[PDB]
Scaffold this active site. Structure first.
Site, PDB file in Angstrom:
ATOM      1  N   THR A 146      15.966   1.494 -45.063  1.00  0.00           N
ATOM      2  CA  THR A 146      15.295   2.716 -45.482  1.00  0.00           C
ATOM      3  C   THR A 146      13.861   2.754 -44.961  1.00  0.00           C
ATOM      4  O   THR A 146      13.303   1.726 -44.579  1.00  0.00           O
ATOM      5  CB  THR A 146      15.278   2.836 -47.016  1.00  0.00           C
ATOM      6  OG1 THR A 146      14.653   1.676 -47.578  1.00  0.00           O
ATOM      7  CG2 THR A 146      16.696   2.949 -47.557  1.00  0.00           C
ATOM      8  N   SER A 147      13.277   3.948 -44.942  1.00  0.00           N
ATOM      9  CA  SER A 147      11.912   4.144 -44.469  1.00  0.00           C
ATOM     10  C   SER A 147      10.959   3.194 -45.197  1.00  0.00           C
ATOM     11  O   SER A 147      11.005   3.081 -46.424  1.00  0.00           O
ATOM     12  CB  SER A 147      11.489   5.597 -44.706  1.00  0.00           C
ATOM     13  OG  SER A 147      10.210   5.856 -44.158  1.00  0.00           O
ATOM     14  N   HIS A 171      11.200  -4.460 -40.978  1.00  0.00           N
ATOM     15  CA  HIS A 171      12.223  -5.115 -41.775  1.00  0.00           C
ATOM     16  C   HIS A 171      12.465  -6.400 -40.994  1.00  0.00           C
ATOM     17  O   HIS A 171      12.073  -6.493 -39.833  1.00  0.00           O
ATOM     18  CB  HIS A 171      13.516  -4.284 -41.812  1.00  0.00           C
ATOM     19  CG  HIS A 171      14.688  -5.018 -42.392  1.00  0.00           C
ATOM     20  ND1 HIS A 171      14.615  -5.722 -43.575  1.00  0.00           N
ATOM     21  CD2 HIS A 171      15.961  -5.159 -41.948  1.00  0.00           C
ATOM     22  CE1 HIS A 171      15.791  -6.268 -43.835  1.00  0.00           C
ATOM     23  NE2 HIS A 171      16.626  -5.941 -42.864  1.00  0.00           N
ATOM     24  N   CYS A 194      10.859  -9.152 -44.282  1.00  0.00           N
ATOM     25  CA  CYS A 194      11.736 -10.005 -45.061  1.00  0.00           C
ATOM     26  C   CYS A 194      12.234 -11.184 -44.236  1.00  0.00           C
ATOM     27  O   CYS A 194      12.287 -11.104 -43.012  1.00  0.00           O
ATOM     28  CB  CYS A 194      12.908  -9.174 -45.576  1.00  0.00           C
ATOM     29  SG  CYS A 194      12.365  -8.109 -46.917  1.00  0.00           S
TER      30      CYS A 194
END
Lengths: 95, 4, 141
Positions: free
Chosen positions: C29-30, C88, C130
């Site tokens: 997601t954004s 991400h 992450c």
């Protein structure tokens, strides 16, 4: 007469190996918020590892996730400093 | 708070 | 000899890769709030006299191209090099807007033997991403 090709690298990871890293939609990521804050306050004096250590403490103590989804609620985070540096690093110089 |  | 020489004409470059929007396939997601990070970083390193270059929403191919090009520049008059990755990620991986790139592929361009004008100089990679899907539930103190 030679140095390791992997020497003089510093990887400042926002989180420990295998873990999620947190980002607040309004204030930005916990790690970057803290990194910029510590750099702004201590870059004119402290050596980089010591600044990053304060970043570790800031993220570890001043942040805890808040979520309507219990699964993502009340979580914590600790950054991960990985240093292959061979000398102390200061973002200033003594003329 | 969201995850990366 | 205990401190890196930081009195070269330039402190060096601060490359910021700000990935906010990803392709559906990634299911990511954004990354709301990343622009705040990018702006904060820009000002922070500007104050430290770094030549900041911000890049938004780069594909994995573009990340590799950018890194390659930057490593091929002449950093002789630069004291150090800083690269900030906002995206991400997974353990050992950073995401381009369209997929994963191994962090090693990115950092290898700057190895002491592949970027001679940076040999012996500090190369910093700041990674906001992450490294897996484990939660740290913490412990009361």
């Amino acid at each position: 007469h030679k140095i390791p090709v992997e020497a003089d690298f510093l990887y400042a990871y926002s989180t420990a190996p295998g873990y999620y890293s947190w980002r607040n939609s309004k204030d930005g990521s916990w790690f970057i918020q803290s990194l910029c804050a510590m750099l702004k306050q201590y870059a004119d004096k402290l050596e980089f590892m010591h600044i990053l250590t304060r970043v570790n403490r800031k993220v570890a103590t001043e942040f805890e996730s808040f979520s309507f989804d219990a699964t993502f609620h009340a979580k914590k985070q600790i950054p991960c400093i990985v240093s292959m540096l061979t000398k102390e690093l200061y973002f200033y110089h003594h003329h | 708070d969201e995850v990366x | 000899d205990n401190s890196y020489k930081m009195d070269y004409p330039e402190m060096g470059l601060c490359i910021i890769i700000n990935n906010k929007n990803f392709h559906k396939s990634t299911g990511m997601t954004s990354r709301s709030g990343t622009d705040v990070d990018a702006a904060n970083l820009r000002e922070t390193f500007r104050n430290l006299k770094y030549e900041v270059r911000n890049k938004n929403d780069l594909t994995r191919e573009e990340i590799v191209e950018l890194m390659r090009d930057v490593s091929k520049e002449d950093h002789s008059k630069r004291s150090s090099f800083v690269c900030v990755l906002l995206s991400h990620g997974e353990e050992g991986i950073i995401f381009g807007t369209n997929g994963p790139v191994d962090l090693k592929k990115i950092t290898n361009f700057f190895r002491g033997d592949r970027c001679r004008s940076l040999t012996g100089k500090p190369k910093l990679f700041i990674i906001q991403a992450c490294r897996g899907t484990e939660f740290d539930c913490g412990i009361e103190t």
